[PDB]
Amino acid sequence: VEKVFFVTSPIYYVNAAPHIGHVYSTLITDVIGRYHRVKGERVFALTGTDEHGQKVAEAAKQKQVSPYDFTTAVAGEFKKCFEQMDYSIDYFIRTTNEQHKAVVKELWTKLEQKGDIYLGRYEGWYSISDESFLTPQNITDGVDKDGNPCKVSLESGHVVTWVSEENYMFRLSAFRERLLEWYHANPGCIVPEFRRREVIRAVEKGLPDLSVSRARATLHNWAIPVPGNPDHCVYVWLDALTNYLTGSRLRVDESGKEVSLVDDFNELERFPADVHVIGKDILKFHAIYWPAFLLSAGLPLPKKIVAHGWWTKDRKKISKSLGNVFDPVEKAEEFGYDALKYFLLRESGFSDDGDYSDKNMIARLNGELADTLGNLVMRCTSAKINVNGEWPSPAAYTEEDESLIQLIKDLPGTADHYYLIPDIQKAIIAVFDVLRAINAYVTDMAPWKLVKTDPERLRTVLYITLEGVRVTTLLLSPILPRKSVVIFDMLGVPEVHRKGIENFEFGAVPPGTRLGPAVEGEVLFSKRSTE
Numbered sequence: 286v287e288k289v290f291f292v293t294s295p296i297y298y299v300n301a302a303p304h305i306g307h308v309y310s311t312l313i314t315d316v317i318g319r320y321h322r323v324k325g326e327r328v329f330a331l332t333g334t335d336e337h338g339q340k341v342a343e344a345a346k347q348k349q350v351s352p353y354d355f356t357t358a359v360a361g362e363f364k365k366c367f368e369q370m371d372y373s374i375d376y377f378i379r380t381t382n383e384q385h386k387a388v389v390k391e392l393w394t395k396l397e398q399k400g401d402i403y404l405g406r407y408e409g410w411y412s413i414s415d416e417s418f419l420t421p422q423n424i425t426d427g428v429d430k431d432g433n434p435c436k437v438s439l440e441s442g443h444v445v446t447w448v449s450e451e452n453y454m455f456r457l458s459a460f461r462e463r464l465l466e467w468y469h470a471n472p473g474c475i476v477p478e479f480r481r482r483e484v485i486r487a488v489e490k491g492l493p494d495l496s497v498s499r500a501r502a503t504l505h506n507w508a509i510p511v512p513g514n515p516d517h518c519v520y521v522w523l524d525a526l527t528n529y530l531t532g533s534r535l536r537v538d539e540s541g542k543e544v545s546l547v548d549d550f551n552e553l554e555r556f557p558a559d560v561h562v563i564g565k566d567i568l569k570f571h572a573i574y575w576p577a578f579l580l581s582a583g584l585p586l587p588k589k590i591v592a593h594g595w596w597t598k599d600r601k602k603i604s605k606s607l608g609n610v611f612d613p614v615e616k617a618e619e620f621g622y623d624a625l626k627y628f629l630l631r632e633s634g635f636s637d638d639g640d641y642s643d644k645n646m647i648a649r650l651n652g653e654l655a656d657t658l659g660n661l662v663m664r665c666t667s668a669k670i671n672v673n674g675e676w677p678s679p680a681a682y683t684e685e686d687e688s689l690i691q692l693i694k695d696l697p698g699t700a701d702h703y704y705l706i707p708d709i710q711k712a713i714i715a716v717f718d719v720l721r722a723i724n725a726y727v728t729d730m731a732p733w734k735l736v737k738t739d740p741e742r743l744r745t746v747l748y749i750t751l752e753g754v755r756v757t758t759l760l761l762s763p764i765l766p767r768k769s770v771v772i773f774d775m776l777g778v779p780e781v782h783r784k785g786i787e788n789f790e791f792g793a794v795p796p797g798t799r800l801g802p803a804v805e806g807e808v809l810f811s812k813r814s815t816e
């Protein structure tokens with residue numbers, strides 16, 4: 286089936302200013318989308334803010350201003366942050382959006398008409414901070430804003446409160462068997478595999494029904510009224526997850542504003558999501574609740590959920606209160622935007638909780654970006670080595686030559702598979718293995734000596750090196766969007782050859798193609814010292 290490739294980030298709570306986690310989640314969403322665009326597919330990448338709920342309402346009361354004003358301000362900080370980060374997200378959705386509210390009421394009504402919503406009670410623990418229902422097994426003793434004996438979440442250490450309310454209940458218990466068939470029928474639907482095994486384990490045990498409304502007073506009336514019952518507000522998470530459906534139904538003008546909400550998702554060809562990017566902390570909502578609502582509603586399920594780990598800086602937890610900040614915009618202004626993105630995507634894979642340090646950041650920048658990639662691009666474009674500033678016509682290939690060409694021919698297929706898992710770390714590693722090999726070959730052939738000893742041999746070496754750099758750069762273009770463009774400009778690659786699977790093939794740029802012009806004292810990535 287040919288559709289718009291639909292990739293999403295979570296929509297983030299606006300209780301506080303944007304930080305590394307949100308930037309990271311959205312970066313992953315952005316990269317996946319960028320990769321599919323270079324394959325020449327239609328893409329719709331979505332991000333946004335989760336604006337209702339007790340959490341956010343209470344954060345706005347502590348700042349002493351109205352929820353409308355608070356949400357709008359912090360939403361503006363998220364937008365500015367994501368604009369500053371230089372993503373290519375197609376739409377930014379806000380749950381306060383009036384068209385989103387409409388979609389929630391449709392979905393709610395669908396679940397009701399299906400017989401999957403009844404009036405009951407929830408008597409149990411709740412984490413306001415995580416907007417999450419918890420069982421006694423998932424709580425323990427801790428301390429509060431005072432240092433008094435309270436209870437807290439085992440998942441996140443946030444304070445939990447006991448809740449005893451008449452609530453509308455969704456019949457989650459009835460979807461155990463269908464969710465299990467879904468996980469087994471699609472054994473790559475949740476990534477990484479161990480997180481997938483976690484979900485199955487939990488659903489195997491049993492599922493209780495889920496509260497999907499709350500008494501209106503508890504939410505400080507900052508939520509979507511339940512259709513036909515204004516005493517209840519819709520569960521912030523049922524509201525939030527619906528953003529994926531809403532976004533799938535919004536037509537967006539060139540400027541980025543929503544102009545229209547279609548009746549049927551099939552109209553825009555986006556739903557269901559091909560990949561939901563999320564953090565491990567919200568897996569249950571996406572892998573258990575969401576598919577269950579969708580099955581209830583008769584809507585198609587997503588194809589993949591990819592769930593990633595948390596970040597630390599210098600092996601310490603990130604918190605401005607604890608005196609350990611990690612400002613991405615600041616670190617990007619220092620070391621470069623593409624470099625920072627590279628590091629975040631290279632340093633840790635999804636199954637791990639990565640660790641930033643200035644030490645390790647400078648090591649990768651210098652080692653991989655400058656010494657391996659940058660160095661190689663300057664060599665094959667240098668006036669010393671490439672005396673005509675053109676793509677030379679290759680002569681006969683040696684066996685060594687071919688060993689390298691084979692690695693390059695194989696690289697796209699391999700990088701492709703990793704991008705589609707998705708496993709961006711392994712895609713990057715694959716590309717740089719090929720880059721290390723090209724460097725080894727260039728050291729080995731010593732083209733600088735060939736300039737005078739064997740010009741005919743130089744043509745071959747130089748052509749392979751150029752083509753290896755082009756192909757590796759193309760495949761890195763979702764990771765280094767701006768730098769890939771500089772590289773292609775230096776290689777003088779025509780625009781048409783900078784995307785499309787046609788240009789994954791070795792030899793797509795003809796000999797005779799002219800290099801771009803040099804600039805006095807230019808460098809791709811410049812090295813930073815070890816303080």
Ligand code: MET
Pocket residue numbers: 294295296297298335525526527528567
């Ligand atoms: C439907 S994704 C909701 C995610 C939630 N607002 C968070 O910040 O964790």
